[PDB]
Design a protein around this ligand. Structure first.
Ligand SMILES: Nc1ncnc2c1ncn2[C@@H]1O[C@H](COP(=O)(O)OP(=O)(O)O)[C@@H](O)[C@H]1O
Lengths: 55, 371, 260, 55
């Protein structure tokens, strides 16, 4: 009974940290895709910068 | 003064000072040499790394354990190992430090002899002594009876000790250990498409083994389970991404210790050699030996090994005997711990082999009761 | 300077004596403010560390001594929180005795049964109780460049907590002495001092033990010290006296008993 | 033994689940640092392009 209670406890731990890894991963990866988007946008604006630097 | 305790072993050298609580320095007992030519002048690359340095430079080296099965084969690499230990892992002048050395039972006497000789000549210690790994492992567990099943990386022995007496005729050495399990895992990992052949990626496989493998309480049931479900598969990321997965292997690999036939060996499994070593001992001391199966060495650190071991050795022994398996949570260093304990004694301070005595009697002195 | 403060008193004493004063002092109820604050009861027989000898002495009560030594503290360089800390530490020392541990059924590994006294002692130091009992029954030592968790048997855990209480009590003693000598100094640039030193004498009894042997050994060292000092002075005086006698050193006869 | 090895297995699962949910927040927060500095340099380059748009 002791191990079963602590086993259901650590099972709550299982489900919560699993779902937590899941949505932290989703948040992270969407934010990083957005970051790569803004990165290529910075590339675009630097292209514009150089084209203007052509005086 | 303080005594040194260097437990060579295979795979892992572990050293420290007597009286301490854990070996100060622990590093792989390998020697690497570059196998390409190198083009950047002024880089001043040395010719042979050693220990953790080599373990880090793995990508461009060729690693070679200088100890094969408890026996030393390449003496120059062994001297390199010892010198690096003393002068970099401990920063200690070995001239004023009696050192304690360990070796498995049933080894070539020339091994231990040359060990003593090099110790007294090259490093010039004041004294030294060679001890049996299993005795120390018993010391570290506070016992004074019971059989001990050490299983390091190269060798695997049982030494039944009772009341401080050792019954040598029942010692059972067996040359199946962690390196063999690593190789068998390298082999069966091919049947998923994973190929590790280099001496470097053998270390990768060793890590995979230390992380994912475990003993299965019942082999057939676990096999049928892994066949049906997929709840046993776990993944692992190699040093360049490309995560891999292993299922059946996780418990097929360490199962070898109980069915050595998997690697073509003919001897009987761990439980069997243990029970046989018991039965070879006198009948009056079999109950205590049943009750005190000590374990040590890194290879006895698989999740579940103690339970499976108890199951088997219970199936073999009579029913009215209490089987117990002393498996501490730090058993990997039990040999070094026991060595520190022993070297720290004072009733031991007259068992050393003094350099004067060796100069008087030559390396043949070791086999003499200056043991 | 305090020197060779006895240690084993705090957790053990023979039948015909007791532990140090402060415990029974707090047990004396001249101020139940502490008795409530240190969560202790009044019956000393409820606390095993101090209850293995004679608790009440028929010479002096411990009540008056409470405020006596309290004032002794106050007049010296002590804050109030300092004193409540001293009291809480003594109470935790007293509490450790009642921490109980039981062997697991499938191993020799110790484990706790009731966290009650654990909770009390842990709160008395403002640190988690579960964490405390865990780190008692599952220590870990630095091996190489990582850590491994050693195992513990019940007896080992009892020895551990005993050493813990002993060490914290002796550290309290040494640091309160530090504070005392911190408040009493005068800032004049000083030089060579004088030495006033008392010590327990060569106290031999009808039933000796460890502490008695240690005291006797201290007195052996002192006797040989002053034996050799009198030797050099007295003897090496007579160099000028045109004659010498008793050419051997005088401390070299206590050496036989010291080396043993 | 059933309850025993079951709790031990799930406790190892929990300890690895922690060993990953720990740096879950780590690779989450590095993403946000990236977002921040990227938006910053976005603003910088948008100001610079406009300043160079003069003639
Ligand atoms: N957690 C683990 N699980 C399984 N095997 C391990 C584990 N840790 C180490 N090992 C194996 O045990 C070996 C280390 O054993 P060790 O006691 O160092 O041997 P030796 O006494 O010869 O030095 C390593 O080679 C490794 O393969």
């Amino acid at each position: 009974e002791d191990s079963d209670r602590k086993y259901e406890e650590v099972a709550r731990k299982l489900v919560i940290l699993e779902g937590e890894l899941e949505r932290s991963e989703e948040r992270a990866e969407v934010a990083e895709s957005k970051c790569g988007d803004l990165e290529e946008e910075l590339k675009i604006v630097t292209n514009n910068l150089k084209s203007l630097e052509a005086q | 003064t303080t005594a040194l305790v260097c437990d060579n072993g295979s795979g892992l050298v572990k050293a420290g000072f007597a009286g301490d609580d854990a070996p100060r320095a622990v590093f792989p007992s390998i020697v690497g040499r570059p196998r390409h030519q190198g083009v950047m002048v002024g880089m001043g690359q040395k010719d042979s790394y050693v220990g953790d340095e080599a373990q880090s430079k793995r990508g461009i080296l060729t690693l070679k354990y200088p100890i094969e099965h408890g026996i030393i084969t390449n003496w120059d690499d062994m001297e390199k190992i010892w010198h690096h230990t003393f002068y970099n892992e401990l920063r200690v002048a070995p001239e004023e430090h009696p050192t304690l050395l360990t070796e498995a039972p049933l080894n070539p006497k020339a091994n231990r002899e040359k060990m003593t000789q090099i110790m007294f000549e090259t490093f010039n210690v004041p004294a030294m002594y060679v001890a049996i790994q299993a005795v120390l492992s018993l010391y570290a567990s506070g016992r004074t009876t019971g059989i001990v099943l050490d299983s390091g990386d190269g060798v695997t022995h049982n030494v039944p000790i009772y009341e401080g007496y050792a019954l040598p005729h029942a010692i059972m050495r067996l040359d199946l250990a962690g390196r063999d399990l690593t190789d068998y895992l390298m082999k069966i990992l091919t049947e998923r498409g994973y190929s590790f052949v280099t001496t470097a990626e053998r270390e990768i496989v060793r890590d995979i083994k230390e992380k994912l493998c475990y003993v299965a309480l019942d082999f057939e049931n676990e096999m049928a389970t892994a066949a049906s479900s997929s709840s046993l598969e776990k993944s692992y990321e190699l040093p360049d991404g490309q995560v891999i997965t292993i299922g059946n292997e996780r418990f097929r690999c360490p199962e070898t210790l109980f069915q050595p036939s998997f690697i073509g060996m003919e001897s009987a499994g761990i439980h069997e050699t243990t029970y046989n070593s018991i039965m070879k001992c006198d009948i009056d001391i079999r109950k205590d030996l049943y009750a005190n199966n000590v374990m040590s060495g890194g290879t006895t650190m698989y999740p579940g090994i103690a339970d499976r071991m108890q199951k088997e050795i219970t199936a073999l022994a009579p029913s009215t005997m209490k089987i117990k398996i002393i498996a501490p949570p730090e058993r990997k260093y039990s040999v070094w711990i026991g060595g520190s304990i022993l070297a720290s004694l004072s009733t031991f301070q007259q068992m050393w082999i003094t350099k004067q005595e060796y100069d008087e009697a030559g390396p043949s002195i070791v086999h003499r009761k200056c043991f | 300077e305090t020197y060779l403060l006895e240690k084993s008193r705090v957790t053990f004493q023979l039948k015909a004596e007791r532990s140090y004063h402060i415990f029974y002092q707090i047990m004396s109820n001249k101020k139940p403010d502490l008795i409530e604050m240190l969560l202790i009861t009044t019956n000393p027989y409820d606390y095993a560390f101090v209850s293995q000898g004679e608790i009440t002495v028929p010479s002096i009560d411990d009540q008056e001594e409470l405020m006596a030594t309290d004032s002794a503290i106050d007049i010296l360089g002590f804050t109030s929180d300092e004193r409540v800390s001293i009291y809480k530490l003594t109470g935790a020392v007293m509490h450790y005795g009642n921490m109980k541990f039981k062997q697991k059924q499938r191993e020799e590994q110790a484990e706790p049964d009731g966290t009650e006294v654990a909770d009390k002692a842990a709160y008395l130091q403002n640190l988690n109780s579960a964490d405390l009992l865990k780190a008692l029954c599952y220590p870990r030592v630095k091996v190489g460049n990582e850590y491994v968790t050693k195992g513990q048997t019940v007896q080992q855990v009892y020895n551990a907590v005993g050493a813990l209480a002993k060490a914290v009590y002796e550290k309290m003693f040494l640091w309160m002495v530090t504070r005392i000598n911190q408040q009493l100094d005068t800032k004049q640039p000083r030089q060579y001092f004088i030495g006033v030193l008392d010590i327990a004498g060569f106290e031999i009894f009808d039933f000796n033990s460890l502490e008695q042997l240690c005291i006797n050994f201290t007195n052996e060292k002192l006797q040989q010290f002053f034996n050799h000092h009198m030797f050099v002075l007295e003897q090496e005086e007579y160099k000028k006296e045109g004659i010498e006698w008793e050419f051997i050193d005088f401390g070299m006869d206590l050496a036989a008993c010291i080396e043993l």
